[PDB]
Design an enzyme around this catalytic site. Structure first.
Site, PDB file in Angstrom:
ATOM      1  N   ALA G   9      48.355  37.614 -38.209  1.00 64.48           N
ATOM      2  CA  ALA G   9      47.583  36.421 -38.521  1.00 64.48           C
ATOM      3  C   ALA G   9      47.440  35.464 -37.343  1.00 64.48           C
ATOM      4  O   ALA G   9      47.024  34.316 -37.547  1.00 64.48           O
ATOM      5  CB  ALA G   9      48.209  35.688 -39.710  1.00 64.48           C
ATOM      6  N   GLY G  11      45.869  36.518 -34.254  1.00 56.04           N
ATOM      7  CA  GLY G  11      44.880  37.056 -33.348  1.00 56.04           C
ATOM      8  C   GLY G  11      43.560  36.322 -33.451  1.00 56.04           C
ATOM      9  O   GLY G  11      43.491  35.182 -33.924  1.00 56.04           O
ATOM     10  N   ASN G 119      40.038  48.392 -36.600  1.00 55.93           N
ATOM     11  CA  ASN G 119      38.952  49.289 -36.249  1.00 55.93           C
ATOM     12  C   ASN G 119      39.467  50.442 -35.398  1.00 55.93           C
ATOM     13  O   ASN G 119      40.339  50.244 -34.542  1.00 55.93           O
ATOM     14  CB  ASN G 119      37.850  48.537 -35.486  1.00 55.93           C
ATOM     15  CG  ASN G 119      36.580  48.382 -36.298  1.00 55.93           C
ATOM     16  OD1 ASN G 119      36.507  48.816 -37.447  1.00 55.93           O
ATOM     17  ND2 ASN G 119      35.570  47.758 -35.703  1.00 55.93           N
ATOM     18  N   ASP G 150      29.207  45.445 -43.436  1.00 58.89           N
ATOM     19  CA  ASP G 150      27.941  46.172 -43.452  1.00 58.89           C
ATOM     20  C   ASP G 150      27.059  45.723 -44.607  1.00 58.89           C
ATOM     21  O   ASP G 150      25.848  45.557 -44.431  1.00 58.89           O
ATOM     22  CB  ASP G 150      28.197  47.675 -43.536  1.00 58.89           C
ATOM     23  CG  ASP G 150      29.224  48.145 -42.529  1.00 58.89           C
ATOM     24  OD1 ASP G 150      29.239  47.609 -41.400  1.00 58.89           O
ATOM     25  OD2 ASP G 150      30.014  49.052 -42.863  1.00 58.89           O
ATOM     26  N   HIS G 177      31.959  52.999 -41.428  1.00 59.85           N
ATOM     27  CA  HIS G 177      31.961  51.644 -40.884  1.00 59.85           C
ATOM     28  C   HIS G 177      31.826  51.667 -39.362  1.00 59.85           C
ATOM     29  O   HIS G 177      32.265  50.743 -38.669  1.00 59.85           O
ATOM     30  CB  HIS G 177      33.230  50.902 -41.308  1.00 59.85           C
ATOM     31  CG  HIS G 177      33.152  49.413 -41.153  1.00 59.85           C
ATOM     32  ND1 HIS G 177      32.233  48.641 -41.826  1.00 59.85           N
ATOM     33  CD2 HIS G 177      33.881  48.558 -40.397  1.00 59.85           C
ATOM     34  CE1 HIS G 177      32.399  47.373 -41.495  1.00 59.85           C
ATOM     35  NE2 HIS G 177      33.392  47.296 -40.629  1.00 59.85           N
TER      36      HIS G 177
END
Lengths: 109, 198, 201, 126, 317, 232, 317
Positions: G9, G11, G119, G150, G177
């Site tokens: 929490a 970043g 990711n 998206d 994604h």
């Protein structure tokens, strides 16, 4: 208008104050009931004597009833009337205004 | 273009016994398109300077739309994506109203002093106006605080107006030639109507 | 003032004034002074005699002051309630009810406090006038003015001035949350999340 | 798109029945003997302000229970209902015998006693 | 349907404030401006499916394009404190940045709600007022100092201490926005709760030193980021609500007030359609003795800060 | 006060005919002005927004001029006007053609002259059941219209003060004037003229052209409710 | 009355997501975690006047204290792109971080809604599933892949193109994604609107390359932050509403589905109290030839990504 909640004011617009009007009646009723209970418990002997006389005679006049009240009554401190309060407030007002009179005079003279 | 000299709500309702729930939508669409046409064809950006407040059939159209919306929202208990919020005291009121309808169809400080303490000090009917005023104020506050069904109908009429505007945009020439025909020829019947639909 | 007598019983005082026609203009200070002067008989009896000695006809005095405050708030437009004119019966939207209540409470509080501060300062002239009226049963304006000008005066603490917005700060649609707005992000109704601080979405 | 205004009168009657058997007869969802209305009454009791919502919740509860029970006992005989519709449409006159035939051959699953709208409080006679 | 332009939306405070303004149902256009790295924030914001539009401008030459028809101007620009740098150089840098931005606003849009967030706001709002005065277009009714952070901290501390509903608790705060110039009016807290003496002292020192607590808890990582973004979003949304004609928008702000002898003061005000509408003076009536001596102690330092601000704002070029 | 009323009445392109104005009529401490509406408005049978704005600016006029001349200590001489404006403002909000409160059920019919007829005061019209949020929007429309026309009247009266002083002198001397005297006193002084509010929107009858639309309905749905609160 | 624990929490993503989660009306306890610089974020959030409580933990040793009694666990941890870094080193670092975090979640609390954000989520959800499988506590119904950005971008682009009511616009997006995996079901956009072939192709390529557009728009300053935080907060609120018994929680997510031959897929699902409740198969029925061929084009590379993920997740220690 005899209530002292805000200052009389027996009329309002919002729902909260209108709902709160009825609560003061219950509070006054409970206070009066407790005062009546205390007064009644103070005079249990007068209770018993006058109730025996009532079942025995079925009718009581002022003289005999007040005689029994004098024989079996407790202390009944009468609150001061308007005149005594006026006199004590008048003497207090005169004494404080003359206190102001010296606290101006000897401070100035 | 000549003015005339009123109760169309009741005839439609008494003539409709087992009508559809979709014809209510068409009735609402037909009763709210004149306002769409007037808002469209009037030129924009005055400070609402050229509005025609408080004349004949606008109030009747608004009343008919409100009545149709009330009928549609009171009969809900697919066609509609959502339903009315259904305030959780409506069924008690309907049940009590039905019960009462069936029951009907099935047939100053006391100026004279008290000589005894058993008697009262003020008359029982002295303060009755204040009690009635407080009761009426409380009832008004209670009733005018729980209208959760005033925002569904507004958005329903909003979508009706948006669809009517989108439809009238494509057929703007139709209304143009039609209002010009009403402008020259002072009367306009159904024959001229259908001829001008070309 | 012209004369004053204590011989008759009435709901209103037995005072008499010299009427002078020509009241074209009357400012807001006149309304404030009328509200103050309306609630006189209750304060004097609460001061000298206490709350347990209020009469029935002396307790129906702040009601008239509250009615005059309602008249000032609703039908003058000089307060902060707005600049409209409302006839009381039915064109009062429920939003304006807490504002009216708070404004009337603030005005009545100011009137009662000012009455207490005035009647406590001139108590010497008050009791001199009371004694003269008790002895004679009839007093006139000249003697009242002489007693007012010759009696000593008692210093008093300043009163809190009446302000309308300071009573309307906590009179709103949401109430008290909206003066303190927490704010929240919502995603439930529809498809768009909104961060709101009191404003509707 | 084909909605009905014909069944509204039965819906109003059901709403009337619910409020009757909650208030009048004391046959509430919790079997409470409190009675708020009588046959000769012109109005109900005091019922407060915060207690009408409880009564409305009970009426909605029993109404929803009735609707759920009816839905459960009518979704089990959908083919039966379709056959009755088709035969009524083609014949325009129906007796009891052909309906008995329909509920027999089409696998009509009838209900069984005891019939309660909520079996959480049912007792039996002695 | 209102437009907000943020000058300095690519810094620490700017990005969360821009994001929260993007979520607001009142903003329809958001104009991010910074000298560098402002296109990334706009690209980040444009992907959200919110109806408000975000446009970015880079460099002072686009600043004239940044402030056209802008209804609310927000100025959070200013470099946070760096190690080894005293108050003088950071004050000069922040004051020069805010001076250039206020000059640009005065040239482009004098009639915009100006919300100053750059620190210290006690010596920045006078600089903006002097710059707006030099163009002959200064409007004291449309110049605010965002000091909602002290109100939020006071509400949070009171709710944590006395255990009330955090939704309902509101604490008025007067004075300034730096050091002992912050005076929480804890005796007028709604809903009404009575405190003790040591509780009052502890709450007062916690409110006054929350800034140093939050800049020393980060261990030299800078100042607070999310909290002033929260407060600035709250103040912007309140100003936008008042701009729509809402008649009950009362907010605590640092504006040019006549309540005290000071030209600028932080108090509760009522905002209307045309800017500042009313200043609540009853916040200064009925104070206790502790708040009175705190006010008289903070007045000297507030006057000194305002004097330093107006002294810098009139320096020769 | 009556000079301000006359000045703002004669500052519009199309107002009612000013028959006469008289100071102190029959000993009463007041004044009376007489305005006759034009025949076209009587023959119309309906009223426009521009006309009620016209009249309510004129009603603001006397009090606004009194406040301009005698200072901000304004008296209660114009109370009736402060009533009328309010009713007039209400007639612009109650109407279904309102841009903000048009598509919302306002005051309802329980089931059943003058140029401007008030729908609010009908015996069969009762106030509707309203939430706390939309009634504030009603009050906001009321206040917005009242303050708009008050600002218009104030700008008008502070625009031409010499004419106001001249007309004040005329009533102070003669105690009565007619519309013709004011009109000849409006002629050689060059006041700042207003725009026409009651200009009609008309269509060219035989001119073959496609008149445009913007592209929308100007009505907005009334939907204002706060987000659900925390700790749920 | 629910608790969310955010792992990472502090970043780029951590602070706006924590700010959005704190002032949401569903959370009541917020347990932030990061290996460093998490105390400042907690101090920043603790000053806000929202009733939800924030606590912070430092180091892996406090990880056992971070996940106790947590209803929703969100893992957005992961280092953003550095210059000179290939996919191998960044993938190894992010996958090791998410492996350690999923190990900690499995050891401490495995009955929490796990939201994977790092990711690529195509190769991270299988890693988390394999790590949860190794402890014998894996629950496929309580493991989600946040791919709603998206959907948000698709809604934004469709509303910008067709000029539609944005409060009604929603677009189904299937696949993955990352890049060409994104298949926006533009023919099922509600309300009903008809597109042209060029418009369909332009919208499809814009939705597929919006991630690259927002990365290269920053000029190497990182990936999407505000819109990703928007999507993460949306999914967190939706999952918290699913925990409350709401019966119409339909969300687009990347979960272990049986709609295709792939073990993991992104589709519309219905979430309940116990996690996943239903998977909407009708998103794969009625597709046009363009969407069908795009699906068969993306299937092979999605299979390659899932195989790469499960291949790394079973590497020996």
């Amino acid at each position: 208008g005899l209530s002292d909640k805000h200052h009389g004011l027996n009329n309002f617009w919002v729902a909260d104050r209108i709902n709160d009007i009825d609560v003061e009646a219950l509070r006054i009723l409970n206070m009066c009931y407790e005062r009546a209970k205390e007064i009644l418990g103070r005079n249990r002997t007068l209770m018993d004597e006058v109730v025996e006389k009532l079942v025995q005679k079925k009718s009581l006049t002022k003289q005999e009833f007040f005689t029994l009240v004098e024989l079996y009554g407790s202390s009944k401190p009468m609150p001061p009337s308007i005149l005594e309060l006026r006199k004590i407030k008048r003497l207090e007002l005169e004494e404080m205004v003359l206190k102001l009179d010296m606290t101006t005079a000897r401070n100035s003279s | 273009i000549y003015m005339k000299k009123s109760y169309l709500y009741k005839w439609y309702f008494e003539l409709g016994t087992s009508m559809k729930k979709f014809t209510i939508l068409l009735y609402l669409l037909s009763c709210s398109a004149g306002s769409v046409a007037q808002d469209l064809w009037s030129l924009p950006v005055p400070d609402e300077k050229n509005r025609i407040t408080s004349y004949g059939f606008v109030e009747n159209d608004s009343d008919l739309v409100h009545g149709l919306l009330e009928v549609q929202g009171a009969l809900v208990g697919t066609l509609l994506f959502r339903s009315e919020p259904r305030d959780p005291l409506y069924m008690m009121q309907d049940g009590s109203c039905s019960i009462v309808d069936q029951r009907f169809l099935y047939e100053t400080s006391q100026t004279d002093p008290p000589t005894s303490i058993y008697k009262r000090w003020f008359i029982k009917n002295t303060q009755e106006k204040h009690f009635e005023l407080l009761i009426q104020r409380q009832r008004w506050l209670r009733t005018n605080s729980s209208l959760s069904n005033g925002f569904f109908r507004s958005n329903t009429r909003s979508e009706s107006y948006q669809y009517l505007s989108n439809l009238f945009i494509s057929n703007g020439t139709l209304l143009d030639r039609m209002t010009k025909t009403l402008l020259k020829k002072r009367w306009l019947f159904s024959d001229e109507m259908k001829i001008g639909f070309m | 003032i012209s004369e004053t007598d204590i011989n008759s019983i009435r709901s209103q005082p037995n005072m008499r004034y010299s009427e002078t026609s020509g009241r074209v203009f009357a400012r807001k200070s006149d309304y404030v002074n009328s509200i103050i002067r309306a609630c006189a008989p209750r304060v004097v009896e609460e001061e000298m005699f206490g709350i347990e000695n209020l009469c029935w006809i002396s307790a129906k005095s702040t009601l008239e002051a509250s009615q005059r405050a309602e008249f000032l708030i609703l039908q003058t437009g000089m307060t902060a309630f707005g600049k409209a004119y409302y006839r009381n019966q039915r064109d009062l939207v429920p939003n304006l009810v807490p504002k009216l209540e708070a404004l009337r409470d603030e005005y009545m509080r100011f009137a009662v406090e000012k009455c207490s501060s005035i009647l406590q300062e001139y108590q010497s002239a008050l009791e001199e006038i009371t004694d003269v009226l008790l002895e004679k049963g009839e007093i006139k304006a000249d003697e009242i003015w002489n007693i007012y000008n010759t009696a000593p005066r008692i210093p008093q603490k300043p009163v809190r001035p009446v302000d309308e917005y300071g009573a309307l700060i906590y009179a709103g649609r949401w109430g008290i949350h909206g003066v303190s707005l927490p704010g929240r992000v919502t995603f439930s109704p529809g498809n768009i999340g909104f961060a709101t601080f009191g404003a509707p979405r | 798109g084909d909605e009905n205004f014909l069944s509204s009168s039965e819906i109003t009657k059901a709403q009337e029945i619910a409020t009757r058997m909650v208030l009048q007869y004391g046959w509430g969802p919790d079997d409470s003997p409190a009675v708020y209305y009588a046959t000769n009454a012109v109005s109900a009791l005091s019922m407060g302000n915060n207690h009408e919502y409880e009564m409305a919740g009970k009426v909605e509860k029993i109404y929803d229970l009735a609707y759920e029970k009816a839905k459960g006992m009518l979704l089990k005989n959908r083919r039966v209902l379709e056959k009755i519709t088709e035969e009524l449409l083609e014949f325009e006159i129906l007796t009891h015998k052909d309906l008995e035939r329909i509920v027999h051959e089409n696998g009509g699953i009838r209900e069984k006693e005891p019939f309660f709208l909520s079996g959480t409080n049912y007792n039996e006679a002695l | 349907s209102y437009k907000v332009a943020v000058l300095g939306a690519a810094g620490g405070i700017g990005q969360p404030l821009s994001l929260l303004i993007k979520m607001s149902p009142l903003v329809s256009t958001l104009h991010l401006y910074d000298i560098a790295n402002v296109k990334g924030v706009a690209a980040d914001l444009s992907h959200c499916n919110t109806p408000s539009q975000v446009r970015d401008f880079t460099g002072p030459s686009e600043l004239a394009d940044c402030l056209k028809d802008v209804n609310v101007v927000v100025i959070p620009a200013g470099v946070p404190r760096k190690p080894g740098m005293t108050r003088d150089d950071l004050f000069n840098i922040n004051a020069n940045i805010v001076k250039t931005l206020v000059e640009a606003v005065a040239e482009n849009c004098p009639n915009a709600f100006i919300h100053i967030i750059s620190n210290p706001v006690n010596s920045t709002v006078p600089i903006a007022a002097e710059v707006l005065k030099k163009k002959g277009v200064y409007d004291p009714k449309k110049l605010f100092g965002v000091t909602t952070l002290d109100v939020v901290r006071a509400n949070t501390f009171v709710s944590q201490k006395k255990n009330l509903k955090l939704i309902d608790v509101d604490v008025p705060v007067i004075g300034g926005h730096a050091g002992i110039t912050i005076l929480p009016l804890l005796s007028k807290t709604k809903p009404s709760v009575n405190f003790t003496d040591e509780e009052i002292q502890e709450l007062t020192v916690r409110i006054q030193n929350a800034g140093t607590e939050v800049v020393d808890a980060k261990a030299g990582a800078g100042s607070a980021t999310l909290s002033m973004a929260y407060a600035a979003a709250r103040f912007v949304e309140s100003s936008l609500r008042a701009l729509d004609g809402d008649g009950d928008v009362y907010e605590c702000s640092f504006v040019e007030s006549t309540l005290t002898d000071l030209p600028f003061f932080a108090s509760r005000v009522k905002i209307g359609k045309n800017g500042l509408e009313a200043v609540i003076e009853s916040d200064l009536q009925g104070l206790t003795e502790y708040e009175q001596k705190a006010l008289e102690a903070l007045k000297v330092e507030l006057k000194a800060s305002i004097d330093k601000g107006v002294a810098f704002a009139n320096k020769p070029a | 006060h009556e000079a301000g009323h006359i000045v703002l009445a004669h500052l519009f392109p199309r107002f009612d005919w000013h028959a006469f104005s008289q100071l102190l009529p029959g000993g009463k401490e007041t004044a009376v002005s007489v305005f006759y509406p034009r025949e076209d408005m009587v023959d119309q049978g309906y009223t426009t927004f521009g006309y009620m704005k016209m009249q309510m600016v004129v009603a603001h006029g006397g009090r606004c001029a009194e406040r301009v001349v005698f200072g901000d200590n304004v008296t209660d001489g114009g109370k009736d006007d402060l009533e009328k404006i309010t009713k007039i403002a209400r007639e612009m909000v109650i109407s279904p053609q309102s841009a903000r409160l048009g598509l919302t059920q306002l005051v309802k019919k329980i089931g059943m002259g003058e140029l401007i007829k008030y729908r609010w005061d009908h015996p069969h019209v009762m106030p509707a059941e309203m939430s706390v949020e939309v009634s504030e929007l009603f009050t906001r429309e009321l206040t917005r219209y009242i303050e708009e026309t008050e600002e218009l009247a104030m700008n008008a009266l502070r625009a031409n003060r010499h004419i106001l002083d001249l007309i004040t002198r005329e009533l102070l001397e003669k105690s009565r004037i007619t519309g013709l005297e004011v009109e000849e006193k409006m002629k050689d002084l060059s006041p700042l003229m207003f725009e026409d509010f009651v200009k009609p929107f008309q269509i060219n009858p035989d001119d073959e052209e496609l008149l445009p639309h913007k592209d929308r309905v100007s009505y907005q749905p009334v939907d204002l409710r706060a987000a659900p609160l925390h700790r749920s």
